[PDB]
């Protein structure tokens, strides 16, 4: 099998932008290659083909070049509809196969995540479990980081993270982190930490409390 | 325009079979491959196989012998593909789409995917916590309250602040799974002024199990 790489998941841009997405393949396969665009629950759609080509239909400001085994896919003043998933594909021999995806999203000012811990529940409790939840909302950019420390020292296991997609309204992320333990497991602890480290601030945002004070 | 209309999302028994559909509009598939390719969560697009409507020859890349079976019916414009002995695995969304019989390869017409989750669990209503402040005297304006929404099973759950009234400001993530049930929080956040003084209730729904839970999220723990 032929594997199409693409480097890059995702990939900041403004409207106006030129924009270029790269796509690898493990062998020569020529210029039989094809560009899609999709968008959240709709069809894939036919962009570019033959490395090249413009499908019909589609706007003259996408392009693409590149032959062998280097192929990319240029957008040239880039439009708030062109914010979608991109992916190439070879067609020069079986099976086809396809690039794992770009995502183009869109820039705007840094914000620094609100960070919110919350203990256990004696409603939860009460059922043998007890799940430590941290919210981190409303930041930019993306990459970010969540450390747990139950009483000063890191903990790997148990936490589990859920991230929404960038808002279509404020372009922010927001992101729950949650240490599940059993009862007894939590109840032998008294310190919980969620500690974020973002590029806007030099010292992570930490928030916690004790178990025998709440 | 020329269109491929896929059937509904399913949730089905592992161990179970499901047949996806995939209904040509504004145009013939006679003269088409019509493909198939599966999109696992977090994974990139893997090829099927295509079958050939017209004749109904079938071509399945050796990861899906015997799992999917491609058929055609150039009468009714549809393609379908069925999927057997599921599994967890093959929890992802599928694609049928078309390309020219002569063509070597590109895909012009695509569509809108089915998503197809496979579990082993039996429905099951969530448990929902409420998630208040501990009282540290530190003194702070805006104020995040929160519910979590745990051991659930299928999807999804919806959940509201004060029946809909507080929709700025609240953040509902995506479930994950913890052992074959579902958990996902939600968060809102208030003006300091205005919790406690004024209520504030996650109403949390899971149609599947005909459940409706509203907790009032109170001072403590």
């Known amino acids: 099998d032929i594997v199409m790489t693409q480097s890059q998941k995702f990939m900041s841009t403004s409207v106006g932008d030129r924009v270029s997405i790269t796509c690898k393949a493990s062998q020569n396969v020529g210029t039989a290659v094809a560009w899609y665009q999709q968008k959240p629950g709709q069809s894939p759609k036919l962009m570019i083909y033959?490395?090249?080509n413009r499908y019909t239909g589609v706007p003259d400001r996408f392009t693409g070049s590149g032959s062998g085994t280097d192929f990319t896919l240029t957008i040239s003043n880039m439009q708030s509809e062109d914010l979608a998933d991109y992916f190439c594909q070879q067609y020069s021999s079986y099976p086809l196969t396809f690039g794992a995806g770009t995502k183009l999203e869109l820039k705007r000012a840094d914000a620094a995540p609100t960070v919110s811990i919350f203990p256990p529940s004696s409603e939860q409790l009460t059922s043998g479990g007890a799940s430590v939840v941290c919210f981190l909302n409303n930041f930019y950019p993306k990459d970010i980081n969540v450390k747990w420390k139950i009483d000063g020292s890191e903990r790997q296991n148990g936490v589990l993270n859920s991230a929404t997609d960038q808002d279509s309204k404020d372009s922010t992320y927001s992101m729950s982190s949650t240490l599940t333990l059993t009862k007894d497991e939590y109840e032998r602890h008294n310190s919980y930490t969620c500690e974020a480290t973002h590029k806007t601030s030099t010292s992570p945002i930490v928030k916690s409390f004790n178990r025998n004070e709440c | 325009e020329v269109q491929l209309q896929q059937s509904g999302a399913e949730v089905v028994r592992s161990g179970a079979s499901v047949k996806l559909s995939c209904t040509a509009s504004g145009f013939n598939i006679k003269d088409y491959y019509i493909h198939w390719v599966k999109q696992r969560p977090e994974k990139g697009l893997e090829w099927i196989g295509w079958?050939?409507?017209?004749?109904?020859?079938?071509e399945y890349v050796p990861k899906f012998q015997g799992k999917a079976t491609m058929t055609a019916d150039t009468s009714s414009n549809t393609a379908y593909l069925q999927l057997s002995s599921l599994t967890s695995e093959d929890t992802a969304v599928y694609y049928c789409?078309?390309?020219?019989?002569?063509?070597?390869?590109?895909?012009?017409?695509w569509g809108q995917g089915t998503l197809v989750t496979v579990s082993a669990a039996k429905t099951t209503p969530p448990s929902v916590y409420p998630l208040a402040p501990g009282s540290a005297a530190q003194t702070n304006s805006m104020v995040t309250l929160g519910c979590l929404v745990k051991g659930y099973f299928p999807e999804p759950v919806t959940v509201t602040w004060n029946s809909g009234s507080l929709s700025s400001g609240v953040h509902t993530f995506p479930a994950v799974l913890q052992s074959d049930l579902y958990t996902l929080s939600s968060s809102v956040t208030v003006p300091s002024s205005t919790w406690p003084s004024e209520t504030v209730t996650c109403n949390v729904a899971h149609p599947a199990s005909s459940t409706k839970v509203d907790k009032k999220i109170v001072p403590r723990d």
């Open positions: 789409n078309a390309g020219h019989d002569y063509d070597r390869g590109r895909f012009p017409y």
């Open positions: 033959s490395a090249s």
């Open positions: 079958i050939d409507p017209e004749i109904g020859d079938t």
